[PDB]
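forwarding from the other thread:

> can someone predict this with manganese (II) ion?

sure thing
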Amino acid sequence: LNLDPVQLTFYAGPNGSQFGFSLDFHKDSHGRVAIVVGAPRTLGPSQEETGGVFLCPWRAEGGQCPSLLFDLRDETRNVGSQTLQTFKARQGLGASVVSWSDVIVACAPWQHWNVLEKTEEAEKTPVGSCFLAQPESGRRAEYSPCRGNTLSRIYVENDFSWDKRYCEAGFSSVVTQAGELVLGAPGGYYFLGLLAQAPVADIFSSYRPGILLWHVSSQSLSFDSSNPEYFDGYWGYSVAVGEFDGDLNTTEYVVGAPTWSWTLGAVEILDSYYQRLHRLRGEQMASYFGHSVAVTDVNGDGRHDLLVGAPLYMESRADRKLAEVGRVYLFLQPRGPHALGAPSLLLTGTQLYGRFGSAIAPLGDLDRDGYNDIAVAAPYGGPSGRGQVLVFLGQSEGLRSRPSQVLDSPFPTGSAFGFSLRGAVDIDDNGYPDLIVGAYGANQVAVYRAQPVVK
Amino acid sequence: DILMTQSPSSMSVSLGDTVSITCHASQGISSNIGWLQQKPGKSFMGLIYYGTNLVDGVPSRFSGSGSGADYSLTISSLDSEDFADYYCVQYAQLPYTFGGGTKLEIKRADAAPTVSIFPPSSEQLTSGGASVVCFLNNFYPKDINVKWKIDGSERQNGVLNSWTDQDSKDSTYSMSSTLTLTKDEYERHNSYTCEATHKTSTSPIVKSFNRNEC
Amino acid sequence: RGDXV
Amino acid sequence: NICTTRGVSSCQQCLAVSPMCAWCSDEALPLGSPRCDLKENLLKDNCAPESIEFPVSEARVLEDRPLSDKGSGDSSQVTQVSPQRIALRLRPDDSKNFSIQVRQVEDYPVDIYYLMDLSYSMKDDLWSIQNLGTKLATQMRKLTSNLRIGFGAFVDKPVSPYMYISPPEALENPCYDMKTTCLPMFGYKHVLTLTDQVTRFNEEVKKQSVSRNRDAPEGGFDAIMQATVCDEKIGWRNDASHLLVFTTDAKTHIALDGRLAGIVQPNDGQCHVGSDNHYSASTTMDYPSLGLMTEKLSQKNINLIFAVTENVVNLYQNYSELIPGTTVGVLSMDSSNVLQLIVDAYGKIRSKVELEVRDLPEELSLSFNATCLNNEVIPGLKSCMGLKIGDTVSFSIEAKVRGCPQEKEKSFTIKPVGFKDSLIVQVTFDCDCACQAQAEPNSHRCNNGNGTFECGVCRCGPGW
Amino acid sequence: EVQLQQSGAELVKPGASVKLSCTASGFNIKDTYVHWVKQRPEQGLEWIGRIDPANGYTKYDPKFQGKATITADTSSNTAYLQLSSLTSEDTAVYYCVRPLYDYYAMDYWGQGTSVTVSSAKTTAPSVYPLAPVCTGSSVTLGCLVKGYFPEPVTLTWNSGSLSSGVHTFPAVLQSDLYTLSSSVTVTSSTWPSQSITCNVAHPASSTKVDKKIEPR
Ligand SMILES: *[C@@H]1O[C@H](CO)[C@@H](O[C@@H]2O[C@H](CO)[C@@H](O[C@H]3O[C@H](CO)[C@@H](O)[C@H](O[C@H]4O[C@H](CO)[C@@H](O)[C@H](O)[C@@H]4O)[C@@H]3O)[C@H](O)[C@H]2NC(C)=O)[C@H](O)[C@H]1NC(C)=O
Ligand SMILES: *[C@@H]1O[C@H](CO)[C@@H](O[C@@H]2O[C@H](CO)[C@@H](O)[C@H](O)[C@H]2NC(C)=O)[C@H](O)[C@H]1NC(C)=O
Ligand SMILES: *[C@@H]1O[C@H](CO)[C@@H](O)[C@H](O)[C@H]1NC(C)=O
Ligand SMILES: [Ca+2]
Ligand SMILES: [Ca+2]
Ligand SMILES: [Ca+2]
Ligand SMILES: [Ca+2]
Ligand SMILES: [Mn+2]
Ligand SMILES: [Mn+2]
Ligand SMILES: [Mn+2]
């Protein structure tokens, strides 16, 4: 409703860097709000794409941002009669970024890894890796839970069980309010997908540079499966956390697997031990149900509600014809120990190939009416196909079925405006929560400030 | 296998000193080295891993350095608990291999031994054996040599020696030497003697007695 | 496993 | 009647009351005689016969070529829809009927492009189809005398983690760590352009060999897209049935899978297969979506045939429901039944006729009565099923206009799905009176120049 | 807190077999490698091998191949070291080790388990008094404990009364039997005026002899 589409703010990165692929708000130890931006194709030292991170201070006029520096050099360690190797070319540093307390986590899902032992090898595979920074102090740490030192022949002799070689850890990421980093790894266990959790404090205190293989004892990984419903399901394509079991001491995990069960797609809600509490199945094969997930209480009962995006959903139209437009599903959490029912609301896109539901961002209470609101991206939507973000207001019964406001992309064709979203943070301290929108195709980020309601 | 030459095997130092222990490898190990401490009569504690990284809980007066095949462990301002055994271990290649160790001992002023000789007891004699005991007590440094003489001639077969570790509150050492013969062989001779050779005196300390006489 | 066992 | 009880003002408003009303423009009309009455009541009141304005809704044919008996020969002078063009004339709120005949012509040309999975899992299948081209040509010879065949192959996107990238030997031979040799990985490669020389198929196939990648889902949808939109390279013929045969034994990658290789750019539906005959966007462009594939298959009139093994039959049948017009056949574990599968698929394809309406004006609504099998009329239906090559069906159609639109000339098309020929309906809306083309503006008869005299009465001129 | 509790001291005969254990406390034995190290006073520290308790794969120094076998039971949170065809050279103290953070390090150690290989049978010690010969201002007496097995022995003077001024020397292996001695020093005014008795206890044979020092 009351986001201002007249006076925007633009931050820009280097051409070709894909500045805006991921973003998040970041607060320093003094509460000052900045913007962390991932640019997964920023050039590195060898004039080669490795990715990069930028930490943008809040200025109404926007502009350029300083780099958040991470070690971009390939590493080698000869130890235990083996050779350990990291490969950072085209790793995609900045394909996901998240901020918690005064700490920034920025991941490279396609960092490769290999181990050599005489004439055998582990195989050079994308285990992924995440980088952690405390900007005010300069502290640095890393976390790569899928690096192993097992040789290729052992996996073959053991029928490829517990094969973490293609995790792509950091493909998605989230932090609990207690400080536990949770990583999505959609390629884990031979492309079933896995989750990796560890406390940020323990990640820092157990890391030292040059070790490459080290133990984070408090960590916790999910499990392999023999159930074919999970094969190639990409469990961990997206992640989120919320309160869904009525017990406030436990934190629950929300995991997207958009190709679960022969591309039907699914979303699962789990406890912190990866035990399955609920499962929400997709409506239509190949619609990518589970591409995005979001958790926020939209109907003011104080119980977290769930939203699922299926950007490739095909809507039925006249004369038995389908049109790909995208769809968003709303599930309201019921009172007490009960399972999530059918969706309370279905939101369906309008523009062909618009990919409505590619990103869903909670906004907090944008219009200050006592109900939290959401924003949905259609990165190729709008009548021009340039991209659109749509705002939906909460209400006692859920969400309004029609958008209160529509943000048309200010960028040229192909910017992917809305591919990443973030709200619920007041960046200018005017008392209204604001919204940042990434458009990596144009290497830019747009800031929409919320202003007082007109109506 | 990789050889780890640790030096020195022992050092006599004082509280508050800054000492260093080196460890040399037969080939490059690229900081894949750990340092270990063993207090007397106790098990092992880890100190350093991967060349320079302190084990959790270890005070910062410990530090490690080096590269290639030459590494060091420094202990700034020694403490009373720091007097113990220290070992290096490389894990650059299998099998893992260790150094020979290093014992840090308390330094004090030189001290001569108190020698005492004891003929066989009557109980042992009626049993058929003969043991002559020689105590060498409270000396410094630990380097000491003993020599048994029967009727003026040295004897080497049948000698069992035992050493104490550095005593707590005087920082001296002690030694026990025992010559055991048969009762019949013990009566073929008359004079029995132990000689103590120390860096204190240039002449050996001598203590004797005579059988069939007192 | 995959394109094969 | 309603023509008189409405109290119309002009000839135009009189016709807009009912298709049965008429108007009299005659000067010598009696005192209180209504100018808007039945044509029978007007002539009864001595209205001059040339003064009657009474349009009638008609429908005459302009092109009525007879249905061809054989699709063989000719430079595609074949006719399978009749009539081809008609002229429709309608007055306000009136309706008129017409008919269309559709025939599944005998001996119509056929293109068959064989798009084959060549991942390592398909190694034994290559040995089974090394004589397929000649054996297929023997069987299809009974149905058509104009057969062209061709071949392409696919594996997957040659990029980590789909591809093995270590040690350097694996790039040249992905079967290095086994005791064999296979080809370097490739995305999609065109092999044999559609041709009537069927031994070219056999000899190309005998030179093919498998590759190897890591993950079970394969990149076949990439190959379907390129084999569809690369018109010239594959060689689809303008006037022929297009059969795309897709054989695999595994799941398939779909759009948005590509992000696991760092590929986020959507598929652009364009052709990216050049002179080297490989798909050059395989490592830079995402797998295509179902909707995009449906659009291009439909645009090029390609019939997709999923010829897959039992372990993934339900999967591809379920995809088949999301791509209308696709058919599925059960492929054995070595492709040894693929010949009969192709023949049955071709029969099922030409066993249906379904009418489609293009560019229909909003004012017009249509209704259909079908006649399939044996002169059995099926009301409210515009599709026939269970047909054989040579059968002929027909449809009774009625167009109903609502009001009278601003434009008086519009034309729409009625076409069977996948057919070349069509029926073009040229519509003319007749809600005007001929006497209006000879009005008297500022006439001396109408309020001394303040009016217009037309069709016998006075109208209030422009500006009042 | 990480702790590695090992089995009790072992005492076996040459040619037999023994199986030591190492139980993980405060963590899951499945988490890291588990190594076994042998220590002797002369030969020093020797790495036997390691095991990944998660999967059971093992490595060994080729010096111990056939002598040592390393196993683990994740269900009991325990790792094992089995030694066969035991000889006198196998008499040593054995440690299990795991790393802290680095995958290959050797940071946490168990308290150790002592192993002794001997054909000797439980033998009680012979206690002999040690009185000086027939002068100074301070006198020194002794006590000789000879020919016992196995260890240990507790030695006190006057039932623990006389405490300071005493040196009890470490036992030494006298061909399948142990020998120990202890000295004590007082003033000439104390002995032989004050009675001094050597108290020795060998709990293995359940004997506690007492021998008073008598002059000559
Ligand atoms: C190709 O499409 C077919 C048609 O949809 C699929 O078959 C369908 O599969 C679904 C899922 O199993 C099945 O739904 C219901 O089946 C039972 C009969 O109604 C019913 O008991 C099931 O309910 C149970 O299972 C669901 C999850 O599956 C739980 O949520 C429930 O709480 C309960 O525990 C289920 O609702 C259809 O019946 C079935 N249809 C047919 C005709 O078989 C194929 O699976 C699909 N194949 C591929 C490869 O995509
Ligand atoms: C399709 O068939 C229906 C009959 O099922 C036709 O409807 C009848 O049309 C006649 C025309 O003379 C009327 O007399 C009947 O009253 C109608 N019956 C019903 C039930 O509506 C219809 O006209 C046909 N349409 C076409 C386009 O052929
Ligand atoms: C319209 O239908 C009648 C039968 O009701 C039929 O006789 C006539 O031929 C049809 N007209 C056309 C143009 O098909
Ligand atoms: Ca909870
Ligand atoms: Ca709620
Ligand atoms: Ca609101
Ligand atoms: Ca604000
Ligand atoms: Mn395959
Ligand atoms: Mn096969
Ligand atoms: Mn594949």
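Chain E has no helices and 19 strands. thats all i got for now
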